[PDB]
């Protein structure tokens, strides 16, 4: 080690700490929501507190931190992350004991957590611009993309530790170390269970303090705001690349948020041993292509454009592997088994289920032996049911030509589709593995191009403003508009106990497939068009 490799070790440890902090935030939210007895809007305000605290100070710390001692401010920010991690687990330590206490036949402690999220927002401020500028200003020429691939590979260790510690600490009770465990009457499958959410934030806070330790032992060298912000914003290639990476990252975010719901509606499977080493090998392979081939600035830009072309070339093959529409009574066709419907809004009742006085808004999916799913066992005509095996006898809403055996023997749940589109589901997950591998080969080039576009005195400000646009308009508003364009195609709306915004149970699978592939595909096509404009104007400039 020549000292600078110690900075890469400390930056790898800080990336492990920030990835761990994000997985611990996204993992233990239901224990906080059940423990503090707060509503959905309040716990969403807790969850958005981190984005508020990061987005408020990211541009000012990324501007003012580059002139100062950079790894000292990274250590100060990681210590602030550790203080927030201790402060998030701190409401467990002084509120006392936690207290918790269908046949279908025809209270103000959360502000602590809020402040901890704000502190953790400051804890994710100084790491990503400043030290990456410290990679580009002090490593040798061509070595920096290899270091970016190395730290993006080592930052995947953090979600693995986050999943393992989240599942292990959600296994036991919240009050372990204080009560006798034989007195607990509830299970982890019970609705009143609260896992040990504080152990997650305690390991996150102490690991952030140990990651804040070795930054203070590194040397500074191994051997106005408005005018500078105007000089960044009036650069046309930079703002074109920021709008480009905003469209591409927004396509990625709106893709992978709803892949498992697309699996549940289209291919019928409920919701990564191999996936995370594939992504880590993709990032390290892309860093090795940029390092080994001695690519210049427009070469890195054409390499990112070629990975975008390759990823979109397999992304457009999702349209040809669609399975059929599911057969549901009362949503896509009538209850009697004969006639389709024009629309799913306020369907008429049939003669078989007219005597059945159950709730039409109640959702409990069953299917018969004909392969047609029914939305409730009351509207399936089933009058008697058995128990660990599932059987609904004497169902009267399945009309055939006098078959005696085709009136009963129905189980619960969505029974799966034919075997023709299970192989198409395997094709979908194989092409998704290929698309995520080519997105990983895209990878470090988005970070690597920014420090070569802008001036060498303003690399950290450019990285901070790019982090503002990517984390702000991609991380927040893009799940909102993909959620709007996905939930506009619901077919069975759930009547919630409180009010509106209930999660719809099933979808119109071809229409939801069309809108979910279409918005992401048009966003990626417009992003690729902005790559072609960027290559043409960037070769014109160079």
């Amino acid at each position: 080690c020549n000292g600078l490799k110690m900075f890469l070790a400390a930056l790898s440890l800080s990336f492990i700490a920030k990835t761990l902090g994000a997985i611990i935030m996204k993992s233990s939210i239901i224990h906080i929501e059940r423990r503090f007895e707060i509503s959905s809007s309040l716990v969403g305000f807790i969850d958005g507190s981190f984005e508020i605290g990061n987005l408020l100070v990211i541009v000012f710390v990324s501007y003012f931190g580059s002139k100062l001692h950079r790894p000292k401010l990274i250590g100060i920010g990681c210590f602030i992350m550790g203080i927030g991690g201790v402060l998030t687990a701190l409401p467990h330590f002084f509120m006392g004991y936690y207290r918790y206490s269908t046949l279908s036949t025809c209270s103000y402690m959360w502000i602590y957590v809020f402040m901890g999220n704000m502190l953790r927002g400051i804890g994710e401020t100084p790491i990503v611009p400043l030290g990456l500028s410290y990679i580009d200003d002090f490593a040798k020429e061509g070595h920096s993309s290899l270091y970016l691939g190395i730290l993006n590979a080592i930052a995947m260790i953090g979600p693995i530790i986050g999943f393992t510690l989240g599942s292990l600490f959600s296994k036991m009770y919240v009050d372990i170390g204080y009560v006798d465990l034989s007195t607990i009457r509830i299970t982890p499958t019970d609705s009143r269970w609260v896992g040990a959410w504080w152990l997650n934030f305690l390991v996150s806070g102490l690991f952030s303090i140990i990651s804040s330790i070795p930054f203070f032992f590194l040397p500074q060298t191994p051997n106005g705001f408005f005018q500078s912000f105007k000089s960044i914003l009036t650069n046309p290639l930079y703002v074109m690349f920021v709008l480009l990476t905003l469209l591409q990252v927004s396509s990625y975010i709106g893709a992978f948020t709803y892949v498992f719901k697309y699996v549940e509606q289209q291919y019928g499977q409920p919701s990564g041993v191999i996936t995370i080493p594939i992504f880590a090998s993709g990032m390290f392979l892309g860093g090795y292509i940029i390092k080994k081939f001695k690519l210049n600035t427009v070469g890195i830009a054409k390499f990112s454009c070629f990975t975008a072309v390759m990823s979109l070339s397999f992304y457009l093959l999702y349209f040809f592997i669609l399975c059929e529409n599911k057969s549901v009574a009362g949503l896509t066709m009538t209850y009697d088994g004969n006639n389709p419907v024009t629309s799913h809004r306020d369907v008429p009742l049939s003669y078989c289920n007219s005597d059945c006085n159950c709730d039409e808004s109640q959702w409990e999916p069953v299917c018969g032996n004909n392969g047609i799913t029914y939305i409730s066992p009351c509207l399936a005509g089933c009058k008697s049911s058995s128990k660990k095996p599932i059987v609904f006898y004497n169902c009267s809403c399945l009309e055939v030509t006098g078959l005696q055996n085709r009136n009963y023997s129905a189980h619960l749940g969505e029974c799966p589709r034919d075997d023709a589109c299970t192989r198409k589901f395997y094709f979908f997950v194989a092409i998704q593995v290929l698309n995520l591998f080519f997105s990983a080969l895209g990878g470090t080039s988005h970070v690597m191009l920014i420090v070569k576009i802008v001036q060498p005195e303003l690399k950290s400000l450019a990285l901070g403003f790019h982090s503002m646009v990517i984390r702000a308009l991609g991380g927040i508003l893009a799940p909102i508009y993909f959620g709007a364009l996905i939930d506009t195609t619901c077919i069975k709306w759930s009547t919630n106990n409180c009010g509106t915004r209930g999660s719809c149970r099933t979808y119109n699978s071809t229409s939801f497939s069309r809108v979910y592939l279409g918005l992401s595909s048009m966003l990626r096509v417009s992003s690729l068009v902005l790559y072609i404009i960027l290559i043409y104007a960037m070769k014109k400039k160079y």
Partner: peptide
Amino acid sequence: XLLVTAGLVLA
């Protein structure tokens, strides 16, 4: 990685 969000700053 998995997931949701992105970045790619994570996973």
